[PDB]
Design a protein around this ligand. Structure first.
Ligand SMILES: O=C(N[C@H](CO)c1ccccc1)c1cc(-c2[nH]ncc2-c2cccc(C(F)(F)F)c2)c[nH]1
Length: 343
């Protein structure tokens, strides 16, 4: 078998001439030549069966991405694994090959206003399809946005994705959360489980602000520091927005803070387009009920050059209990979900 960075990467005979792209705690990514379609693809090696969390993330992604088909969403072209559950240790997911991710781009490249506009359009176009399927991504950030050499954008990593559940979204103050800290909506730290569509719109708002300055807008160093970064810019929530927070611990925490005025967007981003800042304000709205939705965001004057609701497709059907399932049972479901790719 072929070896990459002192690790086994057996994807043959169909996929050859491997090249290391990057790594993650939940898998290794390589580029490879597809001998059937005569095109280079991306291959992600995952080894999840010893950890329940790893198994859950693997299954969520495989189930969702096999059901999804959209230009701004990474696809699953093929899945490589052993012919039996007993012999299956690693799973190789074959996906679209892209040049880079938005995290890598923002470290060294200044984006033109036209690039910010086009990237944001593609993010929201992909997000419209995800939300129309009653799915939440829940981990939108620049590293989960892939770009090819012609600036085509694809949303990836559906490991933390869930079916929207607005009726069961309420929770206590400072409830533990898994998704990336800097892109977490304020209500996560106050009274939300992150089971509504508004959670993804906040992350997109954070991504827009980061595209405008090449710096994360709310770089919290720990759980509660994240909320103070958000409030440091948005200012003290209004009486109406506070009255929407019924939980006493969360409400009294906000009430205990000295009054803070809103830092204007034009002071943080003096070179930014005024229409981009108006849309930013609407995505980075404190109250999740008042926060702009994905279809409104697409119809905003900032995206007028691209907006076409007839060319912004939705899922053919909505998508629809993996948290309380043993890793041995999750392995069985992963085997069953990947069966269609076996010869
Ligand atoms: O699934 C992909 N990315 C996620 C994280 O977002 C992931 C999860 C766990 C471990 C590794 C990766 C994924 C990326 C790609 C991809 N295709 N073409 C290029 C890339 C790419 C680009 C930049 C960085 C990386 C990565 F993930 F290796 F760091 C991969 C395909 N699938």
């Amino acid at each position: 078998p072929e070896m990459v960075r002192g690790q086994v990467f057996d994807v043959g005979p169909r996929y050859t001439n491997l090249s290391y792209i990057g790594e993650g705690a939940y898998g290794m990514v390589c580029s490879a030549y597809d001998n059937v379609n005569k095109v280079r693809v991306a291959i992600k090696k995952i080894s999840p069966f010893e950890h329940q969390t790893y198994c859950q993330r693997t299954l969520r992604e495989i189930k969702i991405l096999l059901r999804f088909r959209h230009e701004n969403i990474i696809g699953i072209n093929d899945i490589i694994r052993a012919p039996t559950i007993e012999q299956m240790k690693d799973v190789y997911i074959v996906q679209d090959l892209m040049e880079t991710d938005l995290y890598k781009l923002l470290k060294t490249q200044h984006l033109s206003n036209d690039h910010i506009c086009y990237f944001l359009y593609q993010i929201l176009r992909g997000l419209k399809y995800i939300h129309s399927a009653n799915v939440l991504h829940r981990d939108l950030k620049p590293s989960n946005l892939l770009l090819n050499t012609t600036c085509d954008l694809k949303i990836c990593d559906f490991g933390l994705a869930r079916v929207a559940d607005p009726d069961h979204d309420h929770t206590g103050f400072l409830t533990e959360y898994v998704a990336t800290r800097w892109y977490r909506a304020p209500e996560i730290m106050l009274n939300s489980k992150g089971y509504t569509k508004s959670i993804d719109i906040w992350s997109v708002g954070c991504i827009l602000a980061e595209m405008l300055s090449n710096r994360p807008i709310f770089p919290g160093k720990h759980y509660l520091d994240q909320l103070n970064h958000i409030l440091g810019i948005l200012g003290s929530p209004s009486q109406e927005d506070l009255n929407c927070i019924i939980n006493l611990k969360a409400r009294n925490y906000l009430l205990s803070l000295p009054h803070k005025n809103k830092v204007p967007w034009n002071r943080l981003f003096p070179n930014a387009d005024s229409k981009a800042l108006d849309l930013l304000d609407k995505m980075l709205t404190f109250n999740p009920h008042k926060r702009i939705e994905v279809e409104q965001a697409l119809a905003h004057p900032y995206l007028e050059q691209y907006y076409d609701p007839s060319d912004e497709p939705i899922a053919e059907a909505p998508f629809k209990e993996l948290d309380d399932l043993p890793k041995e049972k999750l392995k069985e479901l992963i085997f069953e979900e990947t069966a269609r790719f076996q010869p």
